């Protein structure tokens, strides 16, 4: 994505029944949309986790 911007597309921000959605900012790029999902994982931990 461009960094400069914010999505057009808003979040969830207060859950439940009824929730509340919020627009994103140029700066919540952890929440970022996606168009494409990561590749799959099997057990794919260190020596120090497996």
Same mark, same amino acid.
């Given at each position: 994505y461009n960094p400069l911007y914010g999505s057009r597309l808003g979040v969830p921000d207060t859950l439940g029944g009824d929730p509340k959605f919020r627009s994103l900012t %140029?700066?919540? %790029?952890?929440?970022q949309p996606q168009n494409f999902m990561p590749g799959p994982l099997v057990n794919s931990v260190s020596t120090k986790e497996g």
């Open positions: %140029h700066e919540d %790029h952890a929440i």
